[PDB]
Write a protein that binds this ligand. Structure first.
Ligand SMILES: *[C@@H]1O[C@H](CO)[C@@H](O[C@@H]2O[C@H](CO)[C@@H](O[C@@H]3O[C@H](CO[C@H]4O[C@H](CO)[C@@H](O)[C@H](O)[C@@H]4O)[C@@H](O)[C@H](O[C@H]4O[C@H](CO)[C@@H](O)[C@H](O)[C@@H]4O)[C@@H]3O)[C@H](O)[C@H]2NC(C)=O)[C@H](O)[C@H]1NC(C)=O
Ligand SMILES: *[C@@H]1O[C@H](CO)[C@@H](O[C@@H]2O[C@H](CO)[C@@H](O[C@@H]3O[C@H](CO[C@H]4O[C@H](CO)[C@@H](O)[C@H](O)[C@@H]4O)[C@@H](O)[C@H](O[C@H]4O[C@H](CO)[C@@H](O)[C@H](O)[C@@H]4O)[C@@H]3O)[C@H](O)[C@H]2NC(C)=O)[C@H](O)[C@H]1NC(C)=O
Ligand SMILES: *[C@@H]1O[C@H](CO)[C@@H](O[C@@H]2O[C@H](CO)[C@@H](O[C@@H]3O[C@H](CO[C@H]4O[C@H](CO)[C@@H](O)[C@H](O)[C@@H]4O)[C@@H](O)[C@H](O[C@H]4O[C@H](CO)[C@@H](O)[C@H](O)[C@@H]4O)[C@@H]3O)[C@H](O)[C@H]2NC(C)=O)[C@H](O)[C@H]1NC(C)=O
Ligand SMILES: NC(=O)C1CCN(CCOc2ccc(-c3[nH]ncc3-c3ccccc3)c(O)c2)CC1
Ligand SMILES: NC(=O)C1CCN(CCOc2ccc(-c3[nH]ncc3-c3ccccc3)c(O)c2)CC1
Ligand SMILES: NC(=O)C1CCN(CCOc2ccc(-c3[nH]ncc3-c3ccccc3)c(O)c2)CC1
Ligand SMILES: NC(=O)C1CCN(CCOc2ccc(-c3[nH]ncc3-c3ccccc3)c(O)c2)CC1
Ligand SMILES: NC(=O)C1CCN(CCOc2ccc(-c3[nH]ncc3-c3ccccc3)c(O)c2)CC1
Ligand SMILES: NC(=O)C1CCN(CCOc2ccc(-c3[nH]ncc3-c3ccccc3)c(O)c2)CC1
Ligand SMILES: *[C@@H]1O[C@H](CO)[C@@H](O)[C@H](O)[C@H]1NC(C)=O
Ligand SMILES: *[C@@H]1O[C@H](CO)[C@@H](O)[C@H](O)[C@H]1NC(C)=O
Ligand SMILES: *[C@@H]1O[C@H](CO)[C@@H](O)[C@H](O)[C@H]1NC(C)=O
Lengths: 130, 130, 130
């Protein structure tokens, strides 16, 4: 489905915070005893509405809520951390949970370079037939 | 292994309860503030002993207990939610954790339609050899 | 990267403890009510420095700490149990997260026995051409 922003307004810029994902700490700053307190672990960035991604994302978060709330209602876990890992598992099961029938629409196996390897081998025995 | 029910008795019908997995909520019922309390989130169904699945399942649950208890004894997690996700991961690793040697007994890759694609291409160069 | 032990010393033998992974319990010992208390669930073993694995492992644990501490700083989970399962997921995604182009360096599909199946089928139509 496409995402249709249907909110009263949209802030087209996203000034975000998160935790660092790349690069090493400086010196001993990685040691809990020496490093930042809880308030000082955040990085910041700014994203603009290229391709309408920001207004689309605001709408996406809004539309996700019902399914997410129903999921939380049905779980007995007090705090849920496993949603993305389960999505990754389901991604793999969708493609590799059954036998991969080559050339089928649900088998992500490309023998294109494998054809060029065998279609070039036709002249290996049919051309070399002295 | 096959499942041999060895219990004193078997209730051949399973009147079960669980949480809903399909279909949307009605109106605002998905909102925690408005929706059912803890006691009202359950659906019910009834299953009969077709193929002996119910008596088999009672025996299966009984026989699972030792391995499950030994697993719980060895974990330090207070509440364990990850068993099924780990089974899914192990399902994928069993089939895709190594190189898939096509035509081997442990490689779930079907080139049957791939043969028909190349065995039909024999007359592409051997029949068209004017 | 290779592992260079750069510690002041290395105990080349590893006298370890862990929990049992194989074989069934004896009699009723798997029942929590009857089985060992928390202190009695451990097995022990001894490993020597063949292939330098023990001194390498001491260095590996030391070198892992920075990345592990930075990971723990950034998580909101109070107790983290999911690291190995996430590694397994990432192992599968690295190999099977995209289309597998046969004969490419990132596609773990071996058609070697598949070649022998088709290269032996060359004389199925070219040799049998009466
Ligand atoms: C995802 O995005 C959508 C769209 O932005 C949000 O939709 C909102 O949904 C809520 C309901 O959950 C709406 O709130 C309701 O608005 C009704 C209409 O309000 C107007 O009514 C008067 C009289 O006509 C107008 O003059 C005036 O402009 C008001 O704005 C109210 O009548 C509702 O209040 C009544 O019902 C509630 C129960 O729902 C009672 O508790 C109240 O006491 C009262 O009796 C209610 O407030 C809201 O209007 C919707 N917004 C839009 C733009 O459509 C989603 O909420 C959002 N999802 C999430 C998870 O954020
Ligand atoms: C999976 O399914 C199987 C099969 O249904 C269950 O097997 C039961 O296992 C328990 C043991 O955990 C058995 O309980 C034991 O029964 C012994 C025999 O009881 C009979 O003995 C008298 C005298 O001969 C008979 O006349 C009478 O019919 C009794 O039924 C008892 O002797 C045992 O009690 C003694 O030992 C226990 C320690 O185990 C002490 O605590 C007691 O105080 C007492 O000294 C014990 O009660 C039970 O009989 C088995 N059932 C069957 C049908 O074989 C599994 O339990 C089940 N698994 C799970 C997880 O539920
Ligand atoms: C992985 O393995 C490596 C290598 O074994 C470990 O490296 C150690 O790192 C710590 C720092 O975290 C080092 O400790 C520091 O040592 C400094 C040097 O100590 C020497 O200084 C005097 C004067 O020259 C010498 O005569 C004497 O031999 C001392 O040994 C100290 O100066 C440091 O103390 C000062 O700084 C700290 C802040 O870091 C203050 O808190 C102190 O009060 C003081 O002002 C500090 O003690 C240690 O020397 C390193 N060892 C080696 C062998 O290099 C890693 O720690 C290890 N990783 C983990 C996670 O265990
Ligand atoms: N797997 C793991 O352990 C790690 C652990 C911690 N990581 C945290 C980093 O999460 C993000 C998420 C998003 C962005 C990000 N980039 N650009 C725009 C946005 C952005 C987009 C929408 C709304 C807000 C921000 C980012 O920079 C980092 C996540 C994964
Ligand atoms: N070479 C290709 O694949 C083509 C060419 C380049 N295309 C553009 C991809 O542009 C983005 C934009 C954003 C993020 C991104 N980072 N963090 C958070 C977000 C994010 C934020 C809001 C909404 C969605 C995502 C990103 O990762 C990539 C993709 C297709
Ligand atoms: N992945 C996820 O998030 C969801 C979250 C919540 N879901 C709960 C639904 O679980 C079941 C389990 C079983 C049946 C079920 N159907 N028929 C017979 C039986 C049945 C068989 C044996 C004993 C009792 C009942 C069912 O209807 C639903 C589980 C997965
Ligand atoms: N087309 C095929 O694959 C063939 C043809 C159809 N066969 C029959 C499958 O019948 C069932 C029965 C039950 C459930 C089921 N749902 N929920 C819980 C249970 C469940 C309950 C107790 C014990 C085991 C399972 C199910 O899902 C499917 C399968 C092979
Ligand atoms: N997946 C699961 O549920 C299970 C649950 C519990 N299991 C615990 C067993 O963990 C180990 C780890 C290591 C060894 C082990 N063998 N030889 C040498 C060493 C060893 C090497 C380095 C340092 C110490 C010891 C071992 O015997 C068992 C883990 C997995
Ligand atoms: N046939 C092949 O694959 C070849 C031939 C045989 N080679 C030797 C493998 O030797 C080991 C050594 C150790 C463990 C092991 N167990 N538990 C913990 C540890 C462990 C402890 C410290 C450091 C790393 C690991 C193991 O499992 C296997 C491997 C390649
Ligand atoms: C694939 O092509 C290479 C040449 O790039 C060739 O040497 C090789 O033999 C071909 N593959 C097989 C299985 O013959
Ligand atoms: C597979 O068969 C189709 C005809 O259905 C043919 O057009 C195609 O070329 C074949 N595949 C290859 C790689 O040639
Ligand atoms: C693979 O080789 C076997 C002989 O071991 C042969 O019977 C079979 O037909 C070959 N595969 C195909 C797809 O023809």
């Amino acid at each position: 489905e496409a995402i249709v922003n249907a909110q009263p307004k949209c802030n087209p810029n996203l000034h975000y915070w998160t935790t660092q994902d790349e690069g090493a700490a400086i010196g001993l700053a990685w040691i809990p005893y020496f490093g930042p307190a809880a308030e000082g672990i955040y990085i910041e960035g700014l994203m603009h509405n290229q391709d309408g991604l920001i207004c689309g994302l605001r709408q996406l978060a809004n539309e996700t809520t019902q399914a997410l709330q129903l999921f939380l209602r049905a779980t007995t876990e007090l705090r849920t951390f496993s949603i993305l890992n389960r999505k990754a598992i389901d991604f793999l099961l969708q493609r590799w949970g059954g036998t991969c029938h080559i050339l089928g629409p649900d088998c992500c196996i490309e023998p294109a370079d494998w054809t060029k390897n065998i279609t070039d081998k036709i002249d290996q025995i049919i051309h070399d037939f002295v």
